[PDB]
Every structure is written in structure tokens, then in C-alpha cells.
mmCIF file of C-alpha atoms in Angstrom:
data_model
loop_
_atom_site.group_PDB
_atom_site.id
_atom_site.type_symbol
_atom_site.label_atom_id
_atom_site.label_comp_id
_atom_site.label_asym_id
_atom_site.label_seq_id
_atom_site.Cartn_x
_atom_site.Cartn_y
_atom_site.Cartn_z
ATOM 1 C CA UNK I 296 3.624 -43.428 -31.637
ATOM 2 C CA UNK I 297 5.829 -41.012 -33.981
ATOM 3 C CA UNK I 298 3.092 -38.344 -33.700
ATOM 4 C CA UNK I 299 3.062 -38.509 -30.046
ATOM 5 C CA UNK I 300 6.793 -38.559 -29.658
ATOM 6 C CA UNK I 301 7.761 -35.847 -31.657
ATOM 7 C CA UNK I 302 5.299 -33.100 -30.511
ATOM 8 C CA UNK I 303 6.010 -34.002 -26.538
ATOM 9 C CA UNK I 304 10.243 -32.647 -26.764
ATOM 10 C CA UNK I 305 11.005 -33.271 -23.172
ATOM 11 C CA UNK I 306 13.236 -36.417 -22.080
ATOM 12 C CA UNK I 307 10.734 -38.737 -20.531
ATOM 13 C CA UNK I 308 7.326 -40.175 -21.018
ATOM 14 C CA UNK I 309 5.298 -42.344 -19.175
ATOM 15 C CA UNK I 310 3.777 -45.692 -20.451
ATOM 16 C CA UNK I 311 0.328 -44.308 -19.552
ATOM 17 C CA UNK I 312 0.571 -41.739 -22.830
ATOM 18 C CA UNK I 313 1.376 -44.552 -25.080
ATOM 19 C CA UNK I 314 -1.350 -47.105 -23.373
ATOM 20 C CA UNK I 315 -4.057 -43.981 -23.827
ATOM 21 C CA UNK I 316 -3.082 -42.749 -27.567
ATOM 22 C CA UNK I 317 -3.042 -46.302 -28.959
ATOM 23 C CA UNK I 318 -5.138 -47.873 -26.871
ATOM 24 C CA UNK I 319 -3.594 -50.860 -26.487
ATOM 25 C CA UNK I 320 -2.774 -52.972 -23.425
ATOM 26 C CA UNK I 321 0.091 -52.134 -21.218
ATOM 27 C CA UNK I 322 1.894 -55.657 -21.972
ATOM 28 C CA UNK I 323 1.847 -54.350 -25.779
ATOM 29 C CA UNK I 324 3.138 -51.140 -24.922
ATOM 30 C CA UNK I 325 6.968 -51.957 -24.071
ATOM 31 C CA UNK I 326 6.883 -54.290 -27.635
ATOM 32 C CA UNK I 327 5.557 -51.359 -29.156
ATOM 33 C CA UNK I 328 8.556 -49.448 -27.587
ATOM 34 C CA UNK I 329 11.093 -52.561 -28.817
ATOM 35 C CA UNK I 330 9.726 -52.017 -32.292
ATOM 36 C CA UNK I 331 10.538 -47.837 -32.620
ATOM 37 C CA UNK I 332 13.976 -48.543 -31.057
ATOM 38 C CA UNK I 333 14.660 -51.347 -33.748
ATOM 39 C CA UNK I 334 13.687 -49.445 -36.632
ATOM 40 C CA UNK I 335 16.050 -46.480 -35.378
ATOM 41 C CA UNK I 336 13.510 -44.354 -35.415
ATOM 42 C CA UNK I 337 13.923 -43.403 -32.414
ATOM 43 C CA UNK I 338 16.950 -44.213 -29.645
ATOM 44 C CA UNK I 339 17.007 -44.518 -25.769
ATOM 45 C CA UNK I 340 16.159 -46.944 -22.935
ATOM 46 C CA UNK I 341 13.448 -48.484 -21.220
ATOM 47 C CA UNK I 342 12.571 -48.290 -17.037
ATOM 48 C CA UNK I 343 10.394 -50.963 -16.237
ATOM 49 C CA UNK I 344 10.407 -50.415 -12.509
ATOM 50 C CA UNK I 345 9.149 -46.830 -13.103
ATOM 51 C CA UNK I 346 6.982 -47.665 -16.157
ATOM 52 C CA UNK I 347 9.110 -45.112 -18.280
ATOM 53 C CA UNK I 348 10.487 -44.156 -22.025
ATOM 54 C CA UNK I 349 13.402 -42.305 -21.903
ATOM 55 C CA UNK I 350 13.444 -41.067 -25.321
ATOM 56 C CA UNK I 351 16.926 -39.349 -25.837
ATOM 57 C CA UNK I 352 16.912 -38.677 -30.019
ATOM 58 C CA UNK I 353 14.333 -37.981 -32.012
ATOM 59 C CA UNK I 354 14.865 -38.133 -36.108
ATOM 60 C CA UNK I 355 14.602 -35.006 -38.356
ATOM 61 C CA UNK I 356 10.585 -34.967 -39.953
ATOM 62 C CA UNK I 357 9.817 -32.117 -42.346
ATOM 63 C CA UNK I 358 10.443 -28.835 -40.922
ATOM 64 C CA UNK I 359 7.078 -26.599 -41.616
ATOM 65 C CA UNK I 360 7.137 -23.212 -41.897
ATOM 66 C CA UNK I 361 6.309 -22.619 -37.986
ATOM 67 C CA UNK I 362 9.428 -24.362 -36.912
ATOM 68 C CA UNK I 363 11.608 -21.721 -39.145
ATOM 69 C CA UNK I 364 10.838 -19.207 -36.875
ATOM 70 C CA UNK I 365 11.266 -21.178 -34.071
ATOM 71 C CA UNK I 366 14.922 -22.028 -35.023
ATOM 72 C CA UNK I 367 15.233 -18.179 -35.309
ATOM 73 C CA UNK I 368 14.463 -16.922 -31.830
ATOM 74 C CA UNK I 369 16.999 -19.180 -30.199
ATOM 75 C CA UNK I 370 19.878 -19.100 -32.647
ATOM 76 C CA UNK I 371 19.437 -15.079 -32.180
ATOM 77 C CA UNK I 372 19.718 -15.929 -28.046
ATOM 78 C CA UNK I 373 22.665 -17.602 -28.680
ATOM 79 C CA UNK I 374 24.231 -14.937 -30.924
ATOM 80 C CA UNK I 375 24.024 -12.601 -27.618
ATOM 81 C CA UNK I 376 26.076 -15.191 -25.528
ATOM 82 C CA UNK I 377 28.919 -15.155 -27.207
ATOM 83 C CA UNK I 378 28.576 -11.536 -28.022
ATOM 84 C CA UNK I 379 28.871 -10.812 -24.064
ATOM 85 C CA UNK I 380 31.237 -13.133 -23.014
ATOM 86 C CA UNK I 381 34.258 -12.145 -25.393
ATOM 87 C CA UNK I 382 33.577 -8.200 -24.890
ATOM 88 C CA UNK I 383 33.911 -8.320 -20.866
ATOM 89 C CA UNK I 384 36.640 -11.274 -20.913
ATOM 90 C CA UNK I 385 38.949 -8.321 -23.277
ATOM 91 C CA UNK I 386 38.531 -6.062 -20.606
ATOM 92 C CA UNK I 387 39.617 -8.686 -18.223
ATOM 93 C CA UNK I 388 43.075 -8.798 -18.015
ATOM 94 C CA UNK I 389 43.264 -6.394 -20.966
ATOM 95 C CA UNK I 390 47.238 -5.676 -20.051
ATOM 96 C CA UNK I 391 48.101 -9.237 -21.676
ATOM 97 C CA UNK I 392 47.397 -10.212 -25.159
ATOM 98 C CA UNK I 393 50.752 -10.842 -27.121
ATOM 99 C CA UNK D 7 14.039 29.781 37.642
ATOM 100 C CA UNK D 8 15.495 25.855 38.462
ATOM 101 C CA UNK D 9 12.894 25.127 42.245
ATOM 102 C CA UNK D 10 9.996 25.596 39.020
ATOM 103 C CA UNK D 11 11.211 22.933 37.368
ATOM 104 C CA UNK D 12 12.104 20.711 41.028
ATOM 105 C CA UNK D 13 8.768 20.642 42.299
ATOM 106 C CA UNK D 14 6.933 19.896 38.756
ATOM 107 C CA UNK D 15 8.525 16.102 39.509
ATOM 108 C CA UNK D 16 7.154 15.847 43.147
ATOM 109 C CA UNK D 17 3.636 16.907 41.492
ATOM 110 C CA UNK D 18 4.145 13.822 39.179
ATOM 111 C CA UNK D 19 2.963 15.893 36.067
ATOM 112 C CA UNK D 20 5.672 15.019 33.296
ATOM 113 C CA UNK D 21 3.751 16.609 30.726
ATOM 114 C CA UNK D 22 3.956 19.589 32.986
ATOM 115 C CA UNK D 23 8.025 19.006 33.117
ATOM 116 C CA UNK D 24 8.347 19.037 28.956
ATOM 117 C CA UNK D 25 6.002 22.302 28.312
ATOM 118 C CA UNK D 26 8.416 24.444 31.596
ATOM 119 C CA UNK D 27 11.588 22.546 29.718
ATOM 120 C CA UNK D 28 12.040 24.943 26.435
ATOM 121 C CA UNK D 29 12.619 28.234 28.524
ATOM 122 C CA UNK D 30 14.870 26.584 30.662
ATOM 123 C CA UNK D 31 16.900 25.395 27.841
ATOM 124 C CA UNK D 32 17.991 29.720 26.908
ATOM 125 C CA UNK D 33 18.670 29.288 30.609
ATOM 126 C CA UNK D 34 20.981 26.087 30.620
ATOM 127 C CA UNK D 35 23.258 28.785 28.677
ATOM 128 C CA UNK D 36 23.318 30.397 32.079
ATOM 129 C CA UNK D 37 23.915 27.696 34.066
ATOM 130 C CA UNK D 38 27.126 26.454 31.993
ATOM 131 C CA UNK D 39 28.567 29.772 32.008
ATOM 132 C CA UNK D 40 28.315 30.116 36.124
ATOM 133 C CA UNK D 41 30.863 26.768 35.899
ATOM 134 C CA UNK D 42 34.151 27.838 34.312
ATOM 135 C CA UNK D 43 33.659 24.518 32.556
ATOM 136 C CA UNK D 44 36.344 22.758 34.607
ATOM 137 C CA UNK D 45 39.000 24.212 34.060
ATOM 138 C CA UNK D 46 39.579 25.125 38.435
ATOM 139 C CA UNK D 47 37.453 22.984 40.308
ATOM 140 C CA UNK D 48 36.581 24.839 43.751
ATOM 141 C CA UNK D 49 33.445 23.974 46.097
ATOM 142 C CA UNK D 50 31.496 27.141 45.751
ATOM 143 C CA UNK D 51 31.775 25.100 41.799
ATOM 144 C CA UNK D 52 30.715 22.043 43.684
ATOM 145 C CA UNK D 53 27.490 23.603 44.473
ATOM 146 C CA UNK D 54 26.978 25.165 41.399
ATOM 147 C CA UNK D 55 27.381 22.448 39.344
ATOM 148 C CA UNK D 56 24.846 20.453 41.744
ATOM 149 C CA UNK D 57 21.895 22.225 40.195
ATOM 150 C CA UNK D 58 23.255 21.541 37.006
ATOM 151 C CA UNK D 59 22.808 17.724 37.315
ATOM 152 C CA UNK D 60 19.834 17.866 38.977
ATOM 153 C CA UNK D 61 17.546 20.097 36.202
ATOM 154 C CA UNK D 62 19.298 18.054 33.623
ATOM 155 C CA UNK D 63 18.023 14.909 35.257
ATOM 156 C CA UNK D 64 14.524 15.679 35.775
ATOM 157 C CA UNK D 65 14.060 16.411 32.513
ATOM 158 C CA UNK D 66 15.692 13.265 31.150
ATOM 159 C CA UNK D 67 13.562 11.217 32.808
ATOM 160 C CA UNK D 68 10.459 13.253 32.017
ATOM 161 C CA UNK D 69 11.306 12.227 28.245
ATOM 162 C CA UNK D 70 11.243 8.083 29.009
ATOM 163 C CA UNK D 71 7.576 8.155 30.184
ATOM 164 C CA UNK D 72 6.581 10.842 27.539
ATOM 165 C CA UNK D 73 7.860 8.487 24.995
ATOM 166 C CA UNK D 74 9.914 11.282 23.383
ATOM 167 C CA UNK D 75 13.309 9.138 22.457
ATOM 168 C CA UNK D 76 15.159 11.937 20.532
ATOM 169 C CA UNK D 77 15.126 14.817 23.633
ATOM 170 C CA UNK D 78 16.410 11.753 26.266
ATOM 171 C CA UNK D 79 19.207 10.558 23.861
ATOM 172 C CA UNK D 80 20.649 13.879 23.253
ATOM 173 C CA UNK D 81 20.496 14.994 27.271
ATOM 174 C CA UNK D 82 21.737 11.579 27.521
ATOM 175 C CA UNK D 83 24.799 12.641 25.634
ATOM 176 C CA UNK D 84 25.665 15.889 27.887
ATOM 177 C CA UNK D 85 24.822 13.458 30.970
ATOM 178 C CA UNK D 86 27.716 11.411 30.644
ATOM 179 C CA UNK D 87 31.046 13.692 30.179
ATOM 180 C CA UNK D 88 28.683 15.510 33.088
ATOM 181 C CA UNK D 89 29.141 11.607 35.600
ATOM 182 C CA UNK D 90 32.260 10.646 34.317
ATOM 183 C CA UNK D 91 34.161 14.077 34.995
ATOM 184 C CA UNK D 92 37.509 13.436 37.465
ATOM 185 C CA UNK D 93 37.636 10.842 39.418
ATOM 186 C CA UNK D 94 34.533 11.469 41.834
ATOM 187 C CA UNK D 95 32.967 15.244 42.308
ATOM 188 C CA UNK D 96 29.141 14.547 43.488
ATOM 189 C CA UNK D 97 28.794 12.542 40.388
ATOM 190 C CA UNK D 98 27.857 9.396 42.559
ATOM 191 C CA UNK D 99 24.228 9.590 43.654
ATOM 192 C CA UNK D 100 21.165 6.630 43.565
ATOM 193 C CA UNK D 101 19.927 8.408 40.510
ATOM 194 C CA UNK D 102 23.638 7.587 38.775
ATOM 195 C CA UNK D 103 22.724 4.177 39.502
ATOM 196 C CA UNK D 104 19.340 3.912 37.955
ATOM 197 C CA UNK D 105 20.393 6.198 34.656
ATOM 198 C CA UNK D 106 22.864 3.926 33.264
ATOM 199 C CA UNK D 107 20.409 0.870 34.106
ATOM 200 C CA UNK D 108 17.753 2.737 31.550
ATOM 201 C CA UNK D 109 20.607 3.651 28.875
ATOM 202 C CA UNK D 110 21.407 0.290 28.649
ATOM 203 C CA UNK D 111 18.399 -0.971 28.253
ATOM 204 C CA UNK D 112 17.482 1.498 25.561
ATOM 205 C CA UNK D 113 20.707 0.275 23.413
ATOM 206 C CA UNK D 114 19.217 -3.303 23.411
ATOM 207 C CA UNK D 115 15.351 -1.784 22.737
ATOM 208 C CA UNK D 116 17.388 -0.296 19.450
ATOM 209 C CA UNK D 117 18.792 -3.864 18.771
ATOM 210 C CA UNK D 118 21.934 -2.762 17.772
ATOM 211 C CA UNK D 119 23.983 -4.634 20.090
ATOM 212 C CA UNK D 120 27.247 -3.082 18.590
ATOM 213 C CA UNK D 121 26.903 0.009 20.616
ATOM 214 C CA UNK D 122 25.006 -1.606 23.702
ATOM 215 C CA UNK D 123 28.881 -3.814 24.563
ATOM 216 C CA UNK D 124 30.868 -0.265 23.965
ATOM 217 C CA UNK D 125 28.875 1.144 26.281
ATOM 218 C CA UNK D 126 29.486 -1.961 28.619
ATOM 219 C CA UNK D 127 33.252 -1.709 27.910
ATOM 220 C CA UNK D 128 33.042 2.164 29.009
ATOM 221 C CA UNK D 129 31.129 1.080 32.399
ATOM 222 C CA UNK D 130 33.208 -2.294 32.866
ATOM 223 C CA UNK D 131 35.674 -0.400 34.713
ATOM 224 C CA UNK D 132 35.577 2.036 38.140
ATOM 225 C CA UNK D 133 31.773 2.664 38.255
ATOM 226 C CA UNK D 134 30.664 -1.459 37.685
ATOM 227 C CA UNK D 135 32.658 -2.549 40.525
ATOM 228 C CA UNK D 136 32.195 0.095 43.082
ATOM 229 C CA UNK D 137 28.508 -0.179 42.545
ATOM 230 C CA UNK D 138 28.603 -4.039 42.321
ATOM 231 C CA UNK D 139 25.152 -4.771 40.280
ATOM 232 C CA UNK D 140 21.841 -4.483 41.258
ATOM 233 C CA UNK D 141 20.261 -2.349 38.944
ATOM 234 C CA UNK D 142 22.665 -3.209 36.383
ATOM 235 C CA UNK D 143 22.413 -7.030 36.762
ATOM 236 C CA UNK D 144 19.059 -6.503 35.364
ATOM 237 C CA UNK D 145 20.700 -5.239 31.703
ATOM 238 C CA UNK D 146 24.049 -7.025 32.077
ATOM 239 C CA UNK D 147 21.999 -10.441 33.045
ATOM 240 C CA UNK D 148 19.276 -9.488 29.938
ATOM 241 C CA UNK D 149 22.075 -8.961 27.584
ATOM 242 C CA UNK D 150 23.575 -12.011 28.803
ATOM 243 C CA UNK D 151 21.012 -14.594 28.210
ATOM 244 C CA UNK D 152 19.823 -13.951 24.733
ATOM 245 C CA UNK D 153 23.685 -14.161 24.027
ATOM 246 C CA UNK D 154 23.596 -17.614 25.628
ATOM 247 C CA UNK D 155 20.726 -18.859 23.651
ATOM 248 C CA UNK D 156 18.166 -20.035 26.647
ATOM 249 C CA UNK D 157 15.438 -17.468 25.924
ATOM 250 C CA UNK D 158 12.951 -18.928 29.020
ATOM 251 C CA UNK D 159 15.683 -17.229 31.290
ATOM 252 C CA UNK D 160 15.821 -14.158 29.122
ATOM 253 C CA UNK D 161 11.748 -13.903 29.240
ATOM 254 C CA UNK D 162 11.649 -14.476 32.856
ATOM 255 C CA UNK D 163 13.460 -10.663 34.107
ATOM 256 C CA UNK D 164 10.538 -8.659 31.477
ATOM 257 C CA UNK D 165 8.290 -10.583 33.607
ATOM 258 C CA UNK D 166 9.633 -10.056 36.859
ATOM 259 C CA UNK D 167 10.374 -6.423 35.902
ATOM 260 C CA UNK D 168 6.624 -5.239 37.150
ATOM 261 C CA UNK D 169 7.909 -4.800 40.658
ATOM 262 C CA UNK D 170 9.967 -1.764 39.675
ATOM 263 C CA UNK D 171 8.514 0.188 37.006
ATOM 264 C CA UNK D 172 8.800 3.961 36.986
ATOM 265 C CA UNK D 173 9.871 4.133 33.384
ATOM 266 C CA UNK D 174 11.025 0.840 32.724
ATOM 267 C CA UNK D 175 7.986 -0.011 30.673
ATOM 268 C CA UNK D 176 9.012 2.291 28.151
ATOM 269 C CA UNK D 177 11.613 0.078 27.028
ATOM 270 C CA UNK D 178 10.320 -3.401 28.133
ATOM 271 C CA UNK D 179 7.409 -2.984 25.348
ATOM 272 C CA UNK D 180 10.240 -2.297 22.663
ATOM 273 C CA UNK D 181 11.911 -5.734 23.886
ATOM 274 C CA UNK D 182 9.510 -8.407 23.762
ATOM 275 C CA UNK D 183 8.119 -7.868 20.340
ATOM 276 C CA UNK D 184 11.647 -8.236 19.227
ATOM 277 C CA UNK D 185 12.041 -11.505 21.395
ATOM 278 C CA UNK D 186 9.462 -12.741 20.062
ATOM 279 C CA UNK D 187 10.688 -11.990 16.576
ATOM 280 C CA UNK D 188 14.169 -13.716 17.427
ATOM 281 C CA UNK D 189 12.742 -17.016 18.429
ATOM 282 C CA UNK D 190 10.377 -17.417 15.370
ATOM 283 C CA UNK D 191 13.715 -16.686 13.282
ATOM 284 C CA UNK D 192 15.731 -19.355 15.307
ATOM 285 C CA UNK D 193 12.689 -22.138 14.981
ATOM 286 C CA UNK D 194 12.431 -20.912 11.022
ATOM 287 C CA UNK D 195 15.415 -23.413 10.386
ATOM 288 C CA UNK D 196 14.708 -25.835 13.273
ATOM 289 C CA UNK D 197 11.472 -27.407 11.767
ATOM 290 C CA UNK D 198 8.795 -26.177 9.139
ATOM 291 C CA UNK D 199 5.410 -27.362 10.742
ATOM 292 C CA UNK D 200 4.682 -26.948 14.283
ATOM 293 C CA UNK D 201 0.997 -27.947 16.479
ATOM 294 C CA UNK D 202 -0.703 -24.865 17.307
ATOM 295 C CA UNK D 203 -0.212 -25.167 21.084
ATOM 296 C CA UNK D 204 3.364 -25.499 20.242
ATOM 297 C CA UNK D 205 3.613 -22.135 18.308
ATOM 298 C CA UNK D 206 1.897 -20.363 21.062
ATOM 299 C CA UNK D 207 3.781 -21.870 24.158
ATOM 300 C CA UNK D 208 7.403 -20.883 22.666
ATOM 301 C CA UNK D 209 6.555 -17.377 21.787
ATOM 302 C CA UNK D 210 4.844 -17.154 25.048
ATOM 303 C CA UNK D 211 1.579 -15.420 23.397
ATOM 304 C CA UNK D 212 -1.298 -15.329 25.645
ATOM 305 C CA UNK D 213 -3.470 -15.917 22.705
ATOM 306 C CA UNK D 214 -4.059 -17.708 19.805
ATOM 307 C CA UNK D 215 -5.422 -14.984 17.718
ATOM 308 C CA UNK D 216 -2.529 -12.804 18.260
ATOM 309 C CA UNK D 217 -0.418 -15.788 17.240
ATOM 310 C CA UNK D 218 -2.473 -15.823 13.857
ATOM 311 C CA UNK D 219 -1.810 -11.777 13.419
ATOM 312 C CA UNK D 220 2.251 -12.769 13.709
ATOM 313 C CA UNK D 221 1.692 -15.184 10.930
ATOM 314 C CA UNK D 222 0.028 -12.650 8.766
ATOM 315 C CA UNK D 223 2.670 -10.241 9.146
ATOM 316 C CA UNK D 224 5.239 -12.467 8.798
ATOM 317 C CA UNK D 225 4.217 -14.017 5.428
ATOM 318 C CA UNK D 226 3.787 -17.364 6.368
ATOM 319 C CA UNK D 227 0.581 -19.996 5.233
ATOM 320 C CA UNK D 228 -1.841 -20.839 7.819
ATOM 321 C CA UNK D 229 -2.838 -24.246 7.015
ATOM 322 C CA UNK D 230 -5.083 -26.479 9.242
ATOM 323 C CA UNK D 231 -3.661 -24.505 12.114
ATOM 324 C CA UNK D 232 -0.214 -25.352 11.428
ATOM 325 C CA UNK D 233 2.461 -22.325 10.329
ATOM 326 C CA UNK D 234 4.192 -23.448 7.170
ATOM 327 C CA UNK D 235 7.662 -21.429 6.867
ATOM 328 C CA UNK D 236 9.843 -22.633 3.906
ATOM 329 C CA UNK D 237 8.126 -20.995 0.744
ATOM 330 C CA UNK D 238 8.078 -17.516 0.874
ATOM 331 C CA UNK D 239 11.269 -17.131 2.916
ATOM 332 C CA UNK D 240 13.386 -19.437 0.578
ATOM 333 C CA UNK D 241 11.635 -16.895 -2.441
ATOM 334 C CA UNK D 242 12.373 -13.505 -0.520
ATOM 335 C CA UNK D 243 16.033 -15.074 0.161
ATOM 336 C CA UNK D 244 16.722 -15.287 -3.685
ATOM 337 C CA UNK D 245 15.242 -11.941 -5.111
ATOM 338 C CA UNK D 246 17.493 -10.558 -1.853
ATOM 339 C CA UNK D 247 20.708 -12.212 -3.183
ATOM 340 C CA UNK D 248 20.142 -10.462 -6.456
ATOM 341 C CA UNK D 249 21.467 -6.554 -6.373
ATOM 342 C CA UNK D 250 24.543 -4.110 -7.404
ATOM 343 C CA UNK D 251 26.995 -4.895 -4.932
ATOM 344 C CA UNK D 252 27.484 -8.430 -4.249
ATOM 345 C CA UNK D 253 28.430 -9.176 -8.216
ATOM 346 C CA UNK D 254 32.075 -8.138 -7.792
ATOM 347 C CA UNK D 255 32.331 -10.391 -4.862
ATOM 348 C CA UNK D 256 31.142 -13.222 -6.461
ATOM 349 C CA UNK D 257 34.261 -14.153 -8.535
ATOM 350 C CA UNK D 258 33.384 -15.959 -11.897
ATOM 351 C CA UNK D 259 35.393 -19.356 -12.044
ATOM 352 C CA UNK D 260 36.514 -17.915 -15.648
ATOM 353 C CA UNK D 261 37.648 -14.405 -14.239
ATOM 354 C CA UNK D 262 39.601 -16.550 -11.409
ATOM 355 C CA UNK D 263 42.036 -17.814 -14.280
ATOM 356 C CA UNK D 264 42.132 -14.615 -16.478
ATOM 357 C CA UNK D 265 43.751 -13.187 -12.817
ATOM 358 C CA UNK D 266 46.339 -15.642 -11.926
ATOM 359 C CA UNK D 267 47.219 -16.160 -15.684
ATOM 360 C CA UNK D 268 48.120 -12.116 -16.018
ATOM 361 C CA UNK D 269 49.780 -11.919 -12.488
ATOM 362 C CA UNK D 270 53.040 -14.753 -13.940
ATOM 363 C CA UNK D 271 53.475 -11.827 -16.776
ATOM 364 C CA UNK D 272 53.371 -9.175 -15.795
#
């Protein structure tokens, strides 16, 4: 269930991913689900009436060499909004800065 | 030599009207200089100025049923200071009339309906009322409906208009593939799927086929005979909204703040 979990990074998953990876019996999925959340290995909520997890935090695992890079490219991203924003917002009312 | 040019009408040759035209036109130097240009109006002038008018005209219409738009606009253009001059010289006549009705029309074949109400405005006066309208009720009343928003009523006069073609046809071609155009546009909004009967019947296509040909043109899915409008239009709309122009218009919520912040002290 950790494996599974931590690979999909979206917000939601459906019942029907646990039911298939474990293979296990839909009444001993939403234990299963009960367990994680006890542990604090994981955090979130439970729909029943739409047969979803709603996983919302997901605990810090070893960080291969991959996932360096990968921290990389979007830090770099976020480098450039910043970067933008302050040099046009200068010009902007440039008259005023006492 | 302007009896050349008279008779080439009667013959009913208006092919035979534009080659004799480009002579004439060294001539129509002639012609103005035989007027003083209206500066003494006498009735030996009167006369003069008759011919005028009258070559001018011949070879305005000429240009409707060639299909030559550029040499009727710009004949067009002399035409009117020619009418409109004092307050009545021999500038009524049925073929006053019937001119304007074909002007008119051409302003709305343009679609640009800017120019097609200052020409009304111009007309609105004198001339509309003396004449009353019955060559012009078929423009004003055209104009009219597809203003109002009942298209059936605006469709009906093309119809109807078979029983006076001369040169009407020229411009009544233009029209209806824009009609057609303006209801698809309206009905874009109004619902996404339509029956196929249904598509046909409002833009009053004959066929199915050509109904299928509009759809191709226009974009649009085909899909177990039903037209399927809100995909490609919504996509077109966005990359559209995207250019160098509208981006100073916008106003950022964060550049709204910097603006009223500055204006206290300054």
C-alpha cells in the first residue's frame, strides 16, 4: 500500500487500485486504509459514498538519485517567478519608493 | 462620341459597354470642362450637363452585371455630388430612384453596416420623403429585419426579389451566404446538437449535402448526423484572446494597487 501510494502523487485514488494491487476484498480495503492513517504514515480522509482515498500527505522515503534532479527543474521554475515579478513591479510606480 | 455609348445599352451587350468605356473616360475630361462646374447655372448648362448623367449612368450599371465592384464604387462616388447638386436641376429621374436602391444594397453585401446607416442618414431627408419608398422599402425593410432579429421575414424579400432582377442578383448572391452565416452564429450559443432536418430547415438549404459542406468549412464534428459546435469554437476563442494588444487592458489586480497607492503621494 506504501509502494502504491507514493509513486501515484496526485490527491485521490480509488478503492479499485488498492482492491487490485493487494488483492484483497473490498470490505478489507477501507481497514486497510484505517490501518495507514493510524500508523501516521500517511494522513487524509475516507469517501465511502464515492469509494475514495483522499490521500493529502505523504511521508519523506529515501530520496534516490532521480528525484535530485527532479527537485532541480522546479526549484529553477520558481527562481524565474520571483525574478519577473519584482523587476516589472519597480517599474510600476517607479516615482515612489522612500 | 456619347450616342456610341447610348445605343450599346439598348443592344443589351454590357461587355460591349466596358471595352467602348476607357476612350470615353480621356473624353469625360471634355465633358466636365463644357460645365463651368457650377459655378453659374444657366439652361444651355442644363442640357449639357444632361449627357453628363446619362454616359455616367450607363456605365455604372454596366459594372453591377459585369461583376466589376471597384469601377461601380468609384463612378458611384462622382454620381452622388452629381444627384445631390442644388436643390433640384434634372437630378430627379426613375433611374435616381433605382441607383440608390442598388448602393444600398451593396453597403449591406459588404456587411459593414457602419457605412450602410450614414448613407441612410444622408438619404433620410428631402429625397426619402418625396420619393416615399418603393424601391427603397426593399433595402430600408432588408436592413430592418435582420436588425429586429426575425430572419424568416428577412429571407422572404431575397426570395421575392426574382420579379425584378436586372442587376439585383449581383448583390442578392453576396447576401444570403452571409445570412446564412449569421443564423448558424446566433444558434452556436442557443443549443449544441441539433436533428438534421432541423439544421437544414433554419438555414433554409435546399439540400442536405450542402448543409454537410457548411459544416466542413465551419469546423464543426459531424457526428451521427448531428452538428456538434462547442469544441473547436471554445479552442479558437482562447488562442484569439491571446495577442499584443489586449495585455495593457487587462489590469493585473497587483498593478491596480501599485496605481492608487502612488496617486495619494504624489
Amino acid at each position: 500500500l506504501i509502494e502504491t501510494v507514493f509513486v501515484k502523487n496526485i490527491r485521490m485514488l480509488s478503492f479499485e487500485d488498492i482492491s487490485k494491487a493487494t488483492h484483497l476484498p473490498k470490505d478489507n480495503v477501507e481497514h486497510l486504509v484505517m490501518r495507514a492513517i493510524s500508523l501516521g504514515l500517511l494522513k487524509g480522509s475516507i469517501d465511502q459514498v464515492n469509494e475514495l482515498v483522499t490521500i493529502s500527505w505523504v511521508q519523506p522515503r529515501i530520496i534516490s538519485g532521480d528525484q535530485i534532479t527532479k527537485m532541480k527543474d522546479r526549484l529553477v521554475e520558481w527562481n524565474d517567478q520571483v525574478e519577473k515579478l519584482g523587476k516589472k513591479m519597480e517599474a510600476r510606480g517607479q516615482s515612489i519608493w522612500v | 462620341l456619347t450616342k456610341s455609348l447610348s445605343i450599346a445599352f439598348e443592344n443589351g451587350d454590357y461587355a460591349a459597354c466596358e471595352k467602348l468605356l476607357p476612350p470615353i473616360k480621356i473624353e469625360l475630361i471634355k465633358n466636365n470642362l463644357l460645365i463651368p462646374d457650377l459655378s453659374i447655372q444657366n439652361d444651355i448648362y442644363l442640357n449639357d450637363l444632361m449627357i453628363t448623367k446619362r454616359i455616367l449612368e450607363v456605365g455604372a450599371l454596366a459594372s453591377i452585371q459585369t461583376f466589376n465592384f471597384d469601377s461601380f464604387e468609384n463612378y458611384f462616388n462622382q454620381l452622388k455630388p452629381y444627384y445631390f447638386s442644388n436643390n433640384h436641376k434634372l437630378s430627379e429621374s426613375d433611374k435616381k430612384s433605382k441607383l440608390i436602391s442598388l448602393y444600398l444594397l451593396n453597403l449591406l453585401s459588404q456587411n459593414n453596416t457602419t457605412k450602410f446607416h450614414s448613407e441612410l442618414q444622408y438619404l433620410d431627408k428631402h429625397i426619402k420623403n418625396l420619393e416615399d419608398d418603393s424601391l427603397l422599402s426593399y433595402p430600408i425593410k432588408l436592413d430592418r429585419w435582420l436588425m429586429e432579429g426575425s430572419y424568416q421575414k428577412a429571407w422572404d424579400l431575397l426570395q421575392s426579389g426574382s420579379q425584378n432582377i436586372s442587376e439585383f442578383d449581383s448583390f442578392t448572391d453576396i447576401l444570403k451566404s452571409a445570412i446564412r452565416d449569421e443564423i448558424a452564429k446566433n444558434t452556436e450559443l442557443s443549443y449544441d446538437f441539433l436533428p438534421l432536418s432541423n439544421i437544414k430547415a433554419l438555414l433554409f438549404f435546399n439540400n442536405e449535402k450542402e448543409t454537410e459542406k457548411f459544416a466542413l468549412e465551419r469546423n464543426w464534428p459531424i457526428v451521427n448526423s448531428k452538428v456538434y459546435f462547442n469544441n473547436q469554437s471554445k479552442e479558437k476563442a482562447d488562442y484569439e484572446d491571446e495577442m499584443m494588444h489586449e495585455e495593457d487592458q487587462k489590469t493585473n489586480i497587483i498593478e491596480k494597487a501599485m496605481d492608487y497607492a502612488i496617486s495619494i503621494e504624489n
